[PDB]
């Protein structure tokens with residue numbers, strides 16, 4: 001038993017991390033087969049940043065201007081191109097540690113692990129969610145740009161995030177591995193504010209199921225609710241609507257515990273309207289929304305990779 | 306900015322994880338050079354467990370009875386011995402992925418990462434603290450025995466924990482890599498209860514410094530306290546005494562923020578006596594005690610490995 005915020009094992013991603021330097025700027029890149037992916041702003045100084053013309057800056061670079069280091073070893077760059085907000089540096093050596101991988105654009109509410117890196121060297125790993133407002137609540141210092149987020153399914157690493165920016169209040173924005181930002185954000189140092197965030201209702205329910213599985217049952221009430229009536233309450237408390245798809249996705253946890261989803265919704269409604277009254281659930285004094293149903297099953301069933 | 310519970314990158318440990326089977330029992334082992342370390346209870350059935358005589362059970366085993374698998378590959382066992390609560394299986398192949406390593410017995414209050422594993426395959430990684438009562442609040446399912454806890458210092462993996470048991474209320478007990486339990490516990494299925502736990506005061510202070518560094522300052526008051534007067538309050542709230550060593554260890558964070566440790570102690574005293582009043586600190590509605598001062602510096606300074 002027990003329940004922790006649990007990241008994927010990071011080894012398969014660690015073997016892909018490199019350092020990319022262009023001029024004065026150094027950040028991280030991702031080396032897969034014979035391509036290194038990194039944020040396009042490696043080609044900028046911190047005066048280009050107010051509004052860089054990246055296409056223009058890149059035309060004045062050539063392959064040799066990119067210093068790519070995998071540990072101690074320089075990798076010779078033999079081609080380069082820009083795809084949205086990422087650069088692809090073709091190198092003359094394929095990474096022998098490349099795992100089976102895919103690039104995937106994740107949906108808001110889904111979780112992933114971040115391997116935070118500096119100068120191509122991993123610092124730590126932690127689990128995040130893509131927030132409904134397309135930011136992530138990460139932990140990043142200057143030098144972490146190009147760090148990636150990912151999920152692992154058996155042997156296959158699905159890369160979903162590359163770090164680019166920090167927005168006001170210490171939240172983070174970035175791209176998929178095709179270089180397309182999540183959310184309305186752009187890679188320039190200009191006033192941009194995230195939309196107002198919302199709580200990921202299906203994930204809160206998943207975490208209440210995790211609590212039940214772990215024997216922390218105190219909040220289960222004797223009632224039920226309709227989907228529509230629950231959503232009227234979710235709206236008031238800035239929770240996202242619960243859909244029938246969400247109900248179906250919660251099916252495995254509902255079956256395991258014998259608690260119908262709409263019964264769990266009645267218990268969550270009471271928690272929203274009345275509070276926790278100083279009690280905890282799974283050691284938390286707030287309702288947690290960064291565990292997906294799959295995260296709960298994986299952690300409560302021992303899924304390995 | 307940002308602050309997350311952050312585990313060490315797990316790759317160097319993943320490359321050491323194997324499966325060990327003896328008879329009906331399968332669990333995880335740690336393969337370093339030509340030795341596999343695992344819990345001695347691999348030689349038990351789940352009837353031996355009330356009170357096994359491990360020395361006696363082991364005399365009736367020979368090398369070939371231990372099936373050790375590293376991924377797809379069986380490793381031939383050529384020697385075995387017992388050291389306290391761990392078995393050491395000598396194998397005929399040295400692990401080529403062995404990192405620089407040490408075995409270290411950590412002190413209560415210190416943190417480490419756990420790589421949870423099943424059938425020799427890693428499932429996830431998370432950060433824990435050794436509690437003052439010598440348990441850890443982990444996340445472990447049957448099959449996770451032999452999973453290890455560790456810290457990384459640049460290139461060197463310091464292994465500090467191997468998982469053996471779960472105690473009432475879903476907390477966990479285990480050994481160092483010399484097989485000596487943390488705490489009074491024994492590897493048998495007999496009534497054992499942890500001592501009453503306490504809150505790790507120096508770590509709470511470290512986390513308040515992390516909050517200040519991240520701009521979450523609301524709880525800083527205008528006062529100071531003496532060490533003695535603070536400890537009288539810590540005692541009442543089941544917090545461990547703060548020592549001068551702790552004050553000195555907090556020096557780097559105090560210097561960074563300009564807040565003297567005893568001034569931060571006055572702010573913590575007020576939080577203990579008055580509560581948070583529904584506010585959060587670093588996104589938490591409770592005071593967090595599983596970040597050490599070093600954890601805060603590492604995460605707020607970008608230390609890599």
Ligand SMILES: *[C@](O)(C(=O)NC)[C@H](CC[C@H](C)F)NC(=O)[C@@H]1[C@H]2CCC[C@H]2CN1C(=O)[C@@H](NC(=O)OC)C(C)(C)C
Nearest residue numbers: 041140141142143144145164165166187188189190192
């Ligand atoms: C990376 O570029 C990096 O690590 N480089 C070595 C950094 C990481 C900063 C934090 C830790 F996330 N990101 C930037 O500095 C980006 C930069 C590229 C896109 C536009 C440029 C500014 N920038 C920012 O994050 C700014 N954010 C901002 O303008 O938001 C509207 C701030 C944080 C520098 C003000």
Ligand SMILES: *[C@](O)(C(=O)NC)[C@H](CC[C@H](C)F)NC(=O)[C@@H]1[C@H]2CCC[C@H]2CN1C(=O)[C@@H](NC(=O)OC)C(C)(C)C
Nearest residue numbers: 346445446447448449450469470471492493494495497
């Ligand atoms: C490991 O042995 C394992 O994973 N084996 C495949 C397990 C892990 C159990 C949980 C997830 F931690 N541990 C045990 O079952 C141990 C076992 C070895 C030492 C004594 C034996 C009982 N045991 C327990 O953890 C029991 N704890 C207990 O007796 O505490 C006083 C319980 C949890 C099985 C009752």
